[PDB]
Write a protein that binds this DNA or RNA. Sequence first.
DNA 1: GCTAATCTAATCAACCGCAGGTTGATTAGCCCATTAGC
Length: 132
Amino acid sequence: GRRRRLVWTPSQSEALRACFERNPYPGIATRERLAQAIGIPEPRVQIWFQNERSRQLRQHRRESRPWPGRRGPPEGRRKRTAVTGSQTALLLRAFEKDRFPGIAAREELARETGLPESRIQIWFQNRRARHP
DNA sequence: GCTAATCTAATCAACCGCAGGTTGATTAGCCCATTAGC
């Protein structure tokens, strides 16, 4: 079981396209401001930006056009989330039982450890690809 | 089918120390990443 997917509104899509036409690689500041402006969480904005970059690269692949890429100085990234030893131990205990936790498991871990669900999913994806 | 959510692999970068391991954050995926709600 995974997360229930998101459904877009016309104004949300217009804002997403208007923000992507200016900068296809937005920092955490622009992503959070746009998410605050459209009524969806910032992880959803980041996921949509990644998927839009993937589709634009695929489209430049279809049309055999070169992709511009990084233009201008890169914006600031998200500040690294500090995870304590207790939260790390709890995440390791949950990782031994299930390597691929569902949406309910991630929500429960977020309500417990206090870390965002997106950060817990990032930690799980980094832990699966580093501890066989 | 369309596209968000998810996975893995590779890589950049903060952290702590005063060098380079460790782990979180970012990006790309090339019989055009895969899988599953809408």
